[PDB]
UniProtKB/Swiss-Prot annotation, chains A, B:
Subcellular location: Nucleus
Tissue expression as described in the entry: Expressed at varying levels in several tissues, whereas a smaller transcript was expressed specifically in testis.
Protein name: Bromodomain adjacent to zinc finger domain protein 2B
Domain Bromo: 9-113
Lineage: Eukaryota, Metazoa, Chordata, Craniata, Vertebrata
Function: Regulatory subunit of the ATP-dependent BRF-1 and BRF-5 ISWI chromatin remodeling complexes, which form ordered nucleosome arrays on chromatin and facilitate access to DNA during DNA-templated processes such as DNA replication, transcription, and repair. Both complexes regulate the spacing of nucleosomes along the chromatin and have the ability to slide mononucleosomes to the center of a DNA template. The BRF-1 ISWI chromatin remodeling complex has a lower ATP hydrolysis rate than the BRF-5 ISWI chromatin remodeling complex.
Domain of life: Eukaryota
Subunit and partners: Component of the BRF-1 ISWI chromatin remodeling complex, at least composed of SMARCA1 and BAZ2B, which regulates the spacing of histone octamers on the DNA template to facilitate access to DNA. Within the BRF-1 ISWI chromatin remodeling complex interacts with SMARCA1; the interaction is direct. Component of the BRF-5 ISWI chromatin remodeling complex, at least composed of SMARCA5/SNF2H and BAZ2B, which regulates the spacing of histone octamers on the DNA template to facilitate access to DNA.
Assigned protein family: Belongs to the WAL family.
Native species: Homo sapiens
Residues of the full protein shown: 2054 to 2166 of 2168
Amino acid sequence: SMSVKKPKRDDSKDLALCSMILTEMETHEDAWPFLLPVNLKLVPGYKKVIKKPMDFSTIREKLSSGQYPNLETFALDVRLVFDNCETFNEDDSDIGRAGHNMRKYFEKKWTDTFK
Amino acid sequence: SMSVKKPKRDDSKDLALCSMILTEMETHEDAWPFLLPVNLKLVPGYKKVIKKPMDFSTIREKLSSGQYPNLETFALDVRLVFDNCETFNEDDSDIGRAGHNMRKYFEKKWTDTFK
Ligand SMILES: Cc1ccc(O)c(CO)n1
Ligand SMILES: Cc1ccc(O)c(CO)n1
């Protein structure tokens, strides 16, 4: 509260660390469904069903232009990529399986890096 | 943004300074309408019309128990006291005039202390 400060993380390396994690995500062989925005003009249903589209290129742009206030807003956007994938794609599908794999991959990097 | 820190105020004295300002408010001769909560059982209309009642004793309790995260939330509650007063009381009235006087009194102390 006012004039009662909680000891806080050293957050000085967060930007570099998130960039490294995102690079690992981008270079994963199962990243292909998530590198670019879903084409709203060519994919039926997507625009109406997925209220907040997100993809790695968009995350990279936001990270590079100071659009994440902190760690957690970055992780929210990454998780949004996989939440959208799960909403739109059957678990059994190639894209569906890619999403589950990439989510697991991310969360391990996340824990190992910040926890 | 992430890992880009803005130079910040020294806020270490804010708690003490707000307490001093509130003491000056409490001891002002025109503070009498605002020292205790308006009696909702005895004052017709108040409960329905004033959605967020506030008074100096309530502010003092919140300040003393860590319920203001920062300066600005404290100032919001003080201003709420006078906004409520203006809503419910004619400018011409004793209480109405007291509110205008106390608002002016507060804002001068506020500027002189933090600006
Ligand atoms: C390329 C791609 C990636 C993710 C996704 O949900 C879709 C829609 O089937 N398409
Ligand atoms: C004592 C007091 C203080 C402020 C106020 O608005 C009222 C309602 O007339 N009564």
